Amino acid sequence: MNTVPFTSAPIEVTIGIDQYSFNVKENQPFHGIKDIPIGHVHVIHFQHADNSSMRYGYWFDCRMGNFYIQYDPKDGLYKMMEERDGAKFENIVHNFKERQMMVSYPKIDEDDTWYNLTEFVQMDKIRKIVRKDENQFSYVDSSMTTVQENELSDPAHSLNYTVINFKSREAIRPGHEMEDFLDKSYYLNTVMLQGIFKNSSNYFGELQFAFLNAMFFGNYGSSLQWHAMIELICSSATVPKHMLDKLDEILYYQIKTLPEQYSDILLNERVWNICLYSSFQKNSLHNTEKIMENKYPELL
């Protein structure tokens, strides 16, 4: 069980850790988060009480280094940083624990929610979408734009999701226009799975990452990517049976976890009605269709 200590909490802030969130008051003696489960990526995230705009946060894996948060009063944000001195770090953490100035990652033993939302998500893949190679953790916020959004403007601070475009030469083979547009199987299976992602695990990893960046930072481009990756599978007549069964599980946990109140801005009505009721795969996502129908029947 790993620890992300905080130097201090100089400004009033809502701190998120994965799907949990805590209120911290200005100059409250808060020295971080302990009992973080090893074996998953995590995200630590922030909304300042005085500016409920720019949600921002850090994707990290504690197996990859000792990470702490420190407030930077110049850039006005909580910054993730790496401590290279292992003994300094163990010493800082042991003190803060002994003085119980840390919140405990509050995992219920029965609860696989975080595993289920991050099953295919790997820190090495995150660092290819969020390029800042001098750090082992990845910064994301509300306003970051996607490589695709920039085509339609700072490339260093962009989310480099795989570009999916149904009306692109990549998506549509010469002489198979109608077939490739109405059945995206060759785009899914040859271009994207065999060609770019290499396997369904990397495809689902990016799908899961896009969703979480949409939900935790209200990142609109992330939301577009999540919907595009769902729609490409639902619009393919030919998908491996294991990918359909896994997609159903992936979407079920995403829909289950969405705040009830954000359904209106995080869920695209056209994509969901198409996927559940019109697409080739309309009968292949039982768990997802049952939760969507019982939780968001308005949207359908």
Binding site: K167, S168, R169, I172, E177, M178, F181
Partner: protein, 237 residues
Amino acid sequence: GAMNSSNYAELFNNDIKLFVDDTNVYRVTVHKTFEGNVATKAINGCIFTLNPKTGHLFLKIIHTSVWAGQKRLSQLAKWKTAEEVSALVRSLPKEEQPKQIIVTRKAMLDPLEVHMLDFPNIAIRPTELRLPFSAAMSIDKLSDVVMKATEPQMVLFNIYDDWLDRISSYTAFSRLTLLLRALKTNEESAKMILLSDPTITIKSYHLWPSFTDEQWITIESQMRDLILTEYGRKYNV
């Protein structure tokens, strides 16, 4: 974006553009079968591709053989339309290629956009106008060449005959739309109006009668009357 009354003069500027109408591509007769069920028999169709500035009509005849053993024909017809328009653009020299294609029906946008990905600089545009191009098959010489085709065939017409020698594109397009609107509302009455005087004939190389400027004014008046009458009938007003 969408072409309407507000941006109407754009049709007659010096940017090459084509209208595409797919409404006569897939045509059927519906009949009773011996068992008392219903079946369709496809008949020959055509893509109506018109340069509204020059009057050049690229009439691609759709022979019934292109539907043989195909499913979802009303859907295929949109994609076949898009494939034929793309092939026509590809066959034209660069300086003759259109800068815009306007589809008279919105269901043509995706099929044409997908077939024209090799042409990112050609804008594919819908229109708000209700153009009566469906009535092209009420022009006897167009109907004749479609019904007689035994194979796929492209036939070139000028739908304005020699009008541009005396009038502007704008006026030529307005006359054409009035004639087609008339033929669409009451074909019998419209065609009676066009041929009632046997002294005025159709030249072998033309589609419409050889009316003088004065005779066109009288014809144009009779078509507007035809259209308003039929309207007061439709709507009891």
